[PDB]
């Protein structure tokens, strides 16, 4: 009708105004400003430890708070907690559903969250008087496969699923308290701000959105990619975040100014990106492609500064310790590697 | 070198490894099948014939344990989760050949037969299923033979010239399904006709699975 056409025209002219306002504040690029900083030398990393025991495909892993323990999830229906320094196994949790796609470790080291392809997120309690590991709560209410889950606190959790919606739950009650909507395609990854107040998410419609936990409604939207977004991560400062897509390109955004700061890509790489992570100081960026190896960049000049080529299949998960002592990489060949 | 509280941890890790290996040895004694279709193709009827988020079914037939996965209720983007089913023994694809006259609810122009053929083409020529066997079930043929006399088949295929009988129509549909393959060397398609009342579908599945197992065993030893 006429009202629909006039509202669409209004939306188009607001989009034009937003584009003009964004282009107004663009004065310089990061490369020009960082053109005088000395370059970091060639980085050499060696496989200090190799973790074995999984007999299927490994899909996710998460570091602990003390930078000693990590948890990993495999399609053999198993969730394994490791001991990085001594290369030992602490706990092995069976799963009712073997189609796992994500895992999360509580910051207090008390609970572990797991879910995927079953519309259910299960919480497991580690410290039990009985001596075993038991499931505490099964959150249900999603109509699509769960893509990501992160512990907001010891009692709150944030989940992102394949039904184009994000949810914030309450473990003791078992019911949703806030729902975030606005994505057209499925949502793949989310990252939490260091102050535990905001979080960004990425969707298959080549877009990222910022959300506030308290209000529960969106604030900003970032576009620029040409394919699906597979990974996302915050800067240690909290004023920027990096996104990786399937079109062989990584991008770094900013919060105060909604622009493109720098892009990372090469002519010799035509493959997608699965995981992206930062360093403790923010000078160093790591990204794991599916061409059987990882790659490393200087975050301020966009130049490769080392290759962690040690895997025989696609790299799926990558993590960095809180103290920045070592990095961990998992892949489809059922192997974890620690680099220092 | 190790203290008194590290040897116990090492022993616990060894026991965990032993139990994990023992439990993982048992998961290789299962024949995994993935069931697909076009919604109203008749999945439920076939499931209740062969049986005495994601749906899982168990059954046994002559000392063989089957593991059937139905994923029809996902209603999500398939290319984002289709790579989980890499080492599946076989795909079971159900089609109702009595829906050539009808058309889809979403679009009156597009018919269900073309949608089924397009989905079959998409699944068959994927980069993850280069050497995966496909079994094709054509169900509800009695309604098809009762309806073929009233209405011609030229509606779905305008380039058809036949006697408009049951046998020729069934053969033509079978050939049309078979012609979409693009490998013909490392991929095999098995076709069968069935109605509501039958007792011989499980035997067909058993024969196809036996052939796949023989091929895998030959390839493992290097003799193939």
């Amino acid at each position, epitope marked *: 009708g006429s009202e629909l056409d006039q509202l669409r025209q209004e939306a188009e002219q607001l989009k034009n105004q937003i584009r003009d306002a964004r282009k107004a504040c663009a004065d310089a690029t990061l490369s020009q400003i960082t053109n005088n900083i000395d370059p970091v030398g060639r980085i050499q990393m060696r496989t200090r430890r190799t973790l074995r025991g999984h007999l299927a495909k490994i899909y996710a892993m998460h570091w602990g708070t003390d930078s*000693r*323990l990590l948890v990993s999830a495999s399609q053999d229906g198993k969730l394994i907690i490791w*001991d990085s320094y001594t290369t*030992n196994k*602490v706990h092995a949790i069976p799963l009712r559903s073997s189609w796992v796609m994500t895992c999360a470790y509580a910051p207090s*080291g008390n609970y572990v969250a797991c879910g995927g392809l079953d519309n259910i997120c299960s919480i497991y309690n580690l410290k039990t*008087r*009985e*001596g*075993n590991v038991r499931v505490s709560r099964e959150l249900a209410g999603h109509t699509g496969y769960l893509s990501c889950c992160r512990f907001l606190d010891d009692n709150q959790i944030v989940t992102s699923s394949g039904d184009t919606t994000c949810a914030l739950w309450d473990i003791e009650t078992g019911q949703q308290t806030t729902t975030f909507t606005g994505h057209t395609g499925d949502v793949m990854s989310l990252s939490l701000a260091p102050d535990t107040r905001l979080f960004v998410s990425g969707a298959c419609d080549a877009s990222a959105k910022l959300w506030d936990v308290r209000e529960g409604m969106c604030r900003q939207t970032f576009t620029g990619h040409e394919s699906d977004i597979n990974a996302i991560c915050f800067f240690p400062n909290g004023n920027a975040f990096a996104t990786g897509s399937d079109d062989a390109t990584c991008r770094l955004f900013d919060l105060r100014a909604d622009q493109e700061l720098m892009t990372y890509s090469h002519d010799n790489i035509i493959c997608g990106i699965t995981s992206v992570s930062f360093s403790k100081s923010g000078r160093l960026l790591l990204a794991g492609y599916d061409d059987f190896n990882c790659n490393v960049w200087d975050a301020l000049k966009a130049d490769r500064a080392g290759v962690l080529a040690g895997h025989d299949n696609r790299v799926s998960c990558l993590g960095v310790t809180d103290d920045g002592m070592a990095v961990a990489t998992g892949s489809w060949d059922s192997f974890l590697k620690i680099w220092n | 070198t190790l*203290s*008194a*509280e*590290d*040897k*116990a*941890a090492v*022993e*616990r890790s060894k*026991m965990i490894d032993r139990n994990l290996r023992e439990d993982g040895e048992k998961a290789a004694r299962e024949v995994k099948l993935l069931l697909l279709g076009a919604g109203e193709s008749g999945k439920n009827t076939i499931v209740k014939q062969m049986k005495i988020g994601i749906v899982e079914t168990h059954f046994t037939f002559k000392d063989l344990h089957f593991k059937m996965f139905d994923v029809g209720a996902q209603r999500s983007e398939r290319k984002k989760w289709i790579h989980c089913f890499e080492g599946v023994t076989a795909i079971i694809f159900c089609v109702a050949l009595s829906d050539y006259d009808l058309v889809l609810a979403e679009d009156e122009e597009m018919n269900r037969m073309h949608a089924s053929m397009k989905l079959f083409d998409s699944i068959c020529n994927n980069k993850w299923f280069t050497d995966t066997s496909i079994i094709l079930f054509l169900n509800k043929k009695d309604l098809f033979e009762e309806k073929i006399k009233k209405s011609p088949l030229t509606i779905c295929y305008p380039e058809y010239a036949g006697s408009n009988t049951y046998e020729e129509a069934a053969a033509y549909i079978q050939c049309q399904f078979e012609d979409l393959n693009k490998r013909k060397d490392t991929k095999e398609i098995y076709t069968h006709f069935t109605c509501s009342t039958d007792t011989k579908n499980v035997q067909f599945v058993f024969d196809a699975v036996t052939d796949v197992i023989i091929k895998n065993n030959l390839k493992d030893c290097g003799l193939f």
Partner: single-chain antibody
Amino acid sequence: VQLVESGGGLVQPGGSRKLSCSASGFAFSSFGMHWVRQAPEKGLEWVAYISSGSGTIYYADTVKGRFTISRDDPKNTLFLQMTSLRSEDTAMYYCVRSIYYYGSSPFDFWGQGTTLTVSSDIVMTQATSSVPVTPGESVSISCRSSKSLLHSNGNTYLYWFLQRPGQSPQLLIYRMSNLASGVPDRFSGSGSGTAFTLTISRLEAEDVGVYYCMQHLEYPLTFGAGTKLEL
């Protein structure tokens, strides 16, 4: 969670007998078991240890060759067989759980005890034997050894626990710095090298009893003479 012990009676100076204990409320197959002996009006000492999977079995020098340990996981029962008994084997026997991984707290449950009556090593020294106290004032207890308990990995293997009158011992502090579960924050532990101190800020009527310190570097585990507190 509960452990019940039985099989303790009166025996002749020469004979044999078996003691049994049964578990209820926890996964018995994943816990190692310890036997502890406490002489009448004396201290308590370690006897034997059996591990999960029945792979490692450790005995004490004074009972080596005469005591046998056995485990039944299907039925959740621990047996101890005594084939030769002297006149010094009259005491009360307790069964203790233990779990070993990073962050575990061994010697957490002690259960009850059963009475039996018959008709190199690290020395743990506690000079203090009795201290009078009025509620509302802090108390400090000292424990010393002969060899440093600090290992190359950075851990110190010292344990502090309590025994109330007419009751089973309860764990207080493990690894000389970590507070156990179910105990108040009043208790604290510290120390370095060979010297160790346990401090109680505020004392109530439930803090009266005997205190013990233990080491866990190597077998056998050696206990210290108890430190009594009187009101």
